[PDB]
């Protein structure tokens, strides 16, 4: 009803909350996944649902995790006119946590650079996908 | 959560009991003498099965109860090993739990004897934290 | 006994040690001797001394072999106040191994009920008491 | 290896492991831990812990035992085996002097060799554990 | 000593054992396993397992730590130790390179040395076992 | 102040040294080489036992003094561990301090070897505000 997600959120730490709940952003380079390259999945830190895979991730120099594309209708994009700018925010569909923004200067074909906060993700190694419950995606590798 | 994988991650005795319908030894458990307050969930489904409210100080060697939770535990006719007893198991996680005998504190006069190795205990002060908020009213 | 006991103890499997030396209890309906009903002699698994008889072994629903009463003075009753309780333990004399416990809910004429672990016992058929050196007890049949 | 250290490890090996590595036995086919194993990692000598084969050179065989196209470094050794009345090439680990199995020239190229090894003489180490357990020096193979 | 093996043994050490041997610490005096130990045997490296001292050269000391007059076959090495603002001589294991302790020239022997070793860095092996343990190689010492 | 409760809040080492007459590791404790002007007190009774004026360098790895302060310290034969030594314990709290050896820097030649584990150092610039003014005169 209203105590699984509302509870998970309550158990988040300062930054994780600030980001996901207050749409803030973590420091560049001083986060956990910006340079991380282990094979695996990046799940919603709140709803636990798959958001990005280690395969679409790449090396940018912005200081935050960067992917070219997201996962199956699990990540939503929406206009963000806040802060006197005009950007495209990225949020998760199920847990509606702020993730970050998309930019059109990526390396992929479509040229998208999904710039996400480490603080909104729980990384799950490939050798643990089946245990955690992500056998359904174990093929994406 | 995946029943198949979680079961596959249970301890030998937790598997033996819940899956092979085994019986853990007496007095050598974590909940036979347990008297703390809170819920006892299904080690597999996480669904609550018994409450500290109904638990009573029996001296048979396993955590006994006078009453189960609003049907989360079912009664099955068990005629194994030459006897005619009443087996108790979880409807959702379908885990073996134990047996129900007609010899408890009453008025039910029932002694739901359950294996510790089939139950995870969730402290009464960590229920809203673990998501068992709709059960706190029972305390 | 002396050193025989040592090598003899080193023989026992995990459960027999846990039971006989560590006073643990084997699981119910899941031991070799609760069913049995075989005409023989239940010997001490450590000292080889006769502890119980197949004749004094009655059917029970507890799930452990049970005997109305033991043989010789090889079985000894000790006041057991283990686990915040008052009971009556039973152990062999010569070997000093935990057998189990006795009660007063068993069939008369004495009313006692010796509930011993299978782990602490070693069966011996009637056809083998003579050759196995138990000639002296063979009369009990 | 040092007498006591080797002796220590040998003392650990269960029946089958001891039987094959020390007595040159063979494990039943299709009934061993690594024939169909395919997880990316290192196949380590169960006695000396020295790496013997990599998952990268393992191939699906229908013989029933883990098959590799080649061994790692000079740790695996070939040796004439005229036992049982025939002529085959045995393979043993140099350090532990552990009997591994045999090599056949019916392997899937390029060298056409088929190293048929018993799981009983190996201990798999996952790639994601390599550094942690002190196999960094091999982590480069992946 | 091979890195991977080295690591397995270290992972096996307990709190204090790790602290001393790895972090160069010292176990509490009089409250260790071999200070008052006096059994005919070998005291081997708890990591490399090589023999470090003999029960023979071990002697009673009121210091509270295994005291030996000398080590065996250069498996123990001395090294200057100018830490804690003092001047002492550290004693280290060759193969395993674990802190053992210190030496002092206040020994009772013909050469007056006093090797003060933490029990934690040691694992006693009785003589009547030396031959099955793989130490057949040292039985002659006794 | 309460004895049982004052000690019930002690450290693993503190309780060991203090209560079990154990002893800490050399060079690996708070004051073996500490030389700040002030007084060392009983972590338990909070009473003065030594002054840094009596503390000196000892390559043994444990704070060492040539003498204690008044009656807070008592001597006692400790023929344990198969040897004859002279233990030092506190008068009030009755906690194991360590031992006295007759190899000190004199003039008495006594070396009081104490465990940092049974001490609380108090700097001269806090002696008053802490209540040890009547001791401050010792500097």
Residue A132: closest CA among chain B residues belongs to which residue?
Answer: B1
**What CATH number should be reported for the domain whose range is B1-139?**
2.170.150.20
Active-site residue among F44, F113, F114, F127? F113
Active-site residue among E116, E120, E125, E130? E116
In chain A, residues with a C-beta closer than 8 Å to the C-beta of D128 are 38, 125, 127
**CB–CB of F94/F42 below 8 Å?**
no
**CB–CB of C108/C30 below 8 Å?**
no
Closest CA of chain E from D8, distance in Å:
7
Size of interface E-F (CB pairs under 8 A): 28
Task: Kindly determine whether residue E134 and residue D49, on different chains, have CB atoms separated by under 8 Å.
Answer: no
Closest CA of chain E from F25, distance in Å:
5
* DSSP state string for D15-84: HHHHHHHTT---PPTT-SSSSS---SEEEEETTT--EEEEGGGEE--SSSS-EES--SGGGEEEEEE-GG
Residue E62: closest CA among chain F residues belongs to which residue?
Answer: F83
E interface residues, F as partner, C-beta within 8 Å: 25-31, 36, 62, 64, 84-86, 88
Which of C23, C26, C37, C83 has the highest number of chain B CBs within 10 A, making it the mutation to test binding with B? C83
On whether the A1-141 domain is CATH 3.40.50.720, my answer is no
Residue A8: closest CA among chain B residues belongs to which residue?
Answer: B129
- Give the N- to C-terminal CA distance of chain C in Å, as an integer: 28
Question: Given in angstroms, what resolution was this structure solved at?
Answer: 2.6
Residue C81's φ and ψ, nearest 5 degrees, are -110, 35
Task: Kindly determine whether residue D5 and residue E134, on different chains, have CB atoms separated by under 8 Å.
Answer: yes
Secondary structure class of F19 (helix, strand, coil): helix
Q: How many helices (H) and strands (E) does chain A have?
A: 3, 9
Element (H, E) at D8: helix D3-10
A85: β partners? none
F86: β partners? F77
> Least CB-CB distance to B33: which of C24, C27, C83?
C83
**From CA A91, how far away is CA F136, in angstroms rounded?**
66
> Counting Cβ atoms within 10 Å, is residue A36 exposed (0-12), middle (13-18) or buried (19+)?
middle
Q: Cα dist. C44→C56, C94, C123, C131 in Å?
A: 16, 9, 9, 17
Instruction: Calculate the CA dihedral of residues F113, F116, F117, F119 and round it to 10 degrees.
Output: 100
Closest CA of chain E from D81, distance in Å:
29
**From CA A123, how far away is CA A3, in angstroms rounded?**
24
Q: Cα dist. B47→B2, B69, B72, B138, F6 in Å?
A: 14, 10, 7, 15, 44
Active-site residue among B39, B88, B113, B114? B113
Q: Tell me whether the omega of the peptide bond preceding residue F107 falls within 30 degrees of 0, making it cis.
A: yes
Nearest to F103 by CA among F69, F59, F136: F59
Strands of the sheet containing F96-101, edge to edge, are F55-56, F64-65, F111-114, F96-101, F85-90, F73-78
Element (H, E) at C15: helix C14-20
**What CATH number should be reported for the domain whose range is D1-142?**
2.170.150.20
Nearest to B73 by CA among B37, B112, B107: B112
- Give the N- to C-terminal CA distance of chain D in Å, as an integer: 28
Closest CA of chain C from B23, distance in Å:
6
Encode F61-97: b = buried (16+ Cβ within 10 Å), e = exposed.
bbbbbbbbbeebbeeeebeeeeeebebbbbbebebbb
CA angle (E60, E66, E71) in 5-degree steps: 100
**From CA D97, how far away is CA D77, in angstroms rounded?**
9
> Least CB-CB distance to C25: which of B25, B59, B83?
B25
**From CA F132, how far away is CA F138, in angstroms rounded?**
11
DSSP class of residue E119? G
Nearest to C71 by CA among C114, C36, C9, C106: C114
Touching subunits of C (3+ CB pairs, under 8 Å) are: B
**From CA D80, how far away is CA D87, in angstroms rounded?**
7
Task: Kindly determine whether residue B131 and residue A1, on different chains, have CB atoms separated by under 8 Å.
Answer: no
Query: Which residues have CB under 8 Å from E29's CB, separation 6+?
Result: E35, E63, E64, E65, F23, F26
* DSSP state string for B61-118: SS-EES--STTTEEEEEE-GGG--EEEEEETTT--EEEEEES-SSSSS--EEEE-GGG
**From CA F21, how far away is CA E4, in angstroms rounded?**
41
Which of F79, F81, F84, F98 has the highest number of chain E CBs within 10 A, making it the mutation to test binding with E? F81
**From CA E56, how far away is CA E76, in angstroms rounded?**
16
Task: Kindly determine whether residue E8 and residue D134, on different chains, have CB atoms separated by under 8 Å.
Answer: yes
Closest CA of chain F from E138, distance in Å:
32
**CB–CB of C38/C83 below 8 Å?**
no
* DSSP state string for D89-124: EEEEETTT--EEEEEETTSSSSS--EEEE-GGGEEE
Size of interface A-D (CB pairs under 8 A): 4
Q: Cα dist. A41→A98, C31, F20, F78 in Å?
A: 18, 47, 52, 64
A interface residues, D as partner, C-beta within 8 Å: 38, 125, 127
Using only C-alpha atoms, chain B has a radius of gyration, in whole angstroms, of 14
Q: Tell me whether the omega of the peptide bond preceding residue C109 falls within 30 degrees of 0, making it cis.
A: yes
Angle between helices E3-12 and E15-23 (to 10 degrees): 140
Maximum C-alpha span of chain F:
45
Closest CA of chain E from D93, distance in Å:
16
Instruction: Calculate the CA dihedral of residues E10, E15, E21, E25 and round it to 10 degrees.
Output: 160
Experimental technique of record: X-ray
Task: Kindly determine whether residue C24 and residue B22, on different chains, have CB atoms separated by under 8 Å.
Answer: no
Which of E2, E3, E4, E48 has the highest number of chain D CBs within 10 A, making it the mutation to test binding with D? E4
A40: β partners? A125
In chain F, residues with a C-beta closer than 8 Å to the C-beta of E36 are 81-82
Secondary structure class of A23 (helix, strand, coil): coil
Nearest to F125 by CA among F73, F52, F66, F57: F52
Residue B84: closest CA among chain C residues belongs to which residue?
Answer: C61
C115 is a catalytic site residue: yes
DSSP class of residue C131? I
Q: Tell me whether the omega of the peptide bond preceding residue B107 falls within 30 degrees of 0, making it cis.
A: yes
**CB–CB of D33/D119 below 8 Å?**
yes
**From CA A32, how far away is CA E2, in angstroms rounded?**
33
**From CA D99, how far away is CA B127, in angstroms rounded?**
57
C-beta neighbour count of E70 within 10 angstroms: 17
**From CA E89, how far away is CA E71, in angstroms rounded?**
14
């Amino acid at each position: 009803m209203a105590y699984n997600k509302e509870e998970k959120i309550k158990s988040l730490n300062r930054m994780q909350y600030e980001v996901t709940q207050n749409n803030g952003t973590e420091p560049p380079f001083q986060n956990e996944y910006w340079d991380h390259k282990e094979e695996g999945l990046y799940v919603d830190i709140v709803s636990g649902k798959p958001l990005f895979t280690s395969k679409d991730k790449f090396d940018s120099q912005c200081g935050w995790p960067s992917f070219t594309k997201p996962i199956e209708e699990e990540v939503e994009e929406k206009l963000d006119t806040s802060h006197g700018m005009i950007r495209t925010e990225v949020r998760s569909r199920t847990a509606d946590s702020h993730l970050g923004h998309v930019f059109n200067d990526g390396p992929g074909p479509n040229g998208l650079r999904y710039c996400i906060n480490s603080a909104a993700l729980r990384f799950v190694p490939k050798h643990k996908l089946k245990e955690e419950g992500y056998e359904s995606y174990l093929h994406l590798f």
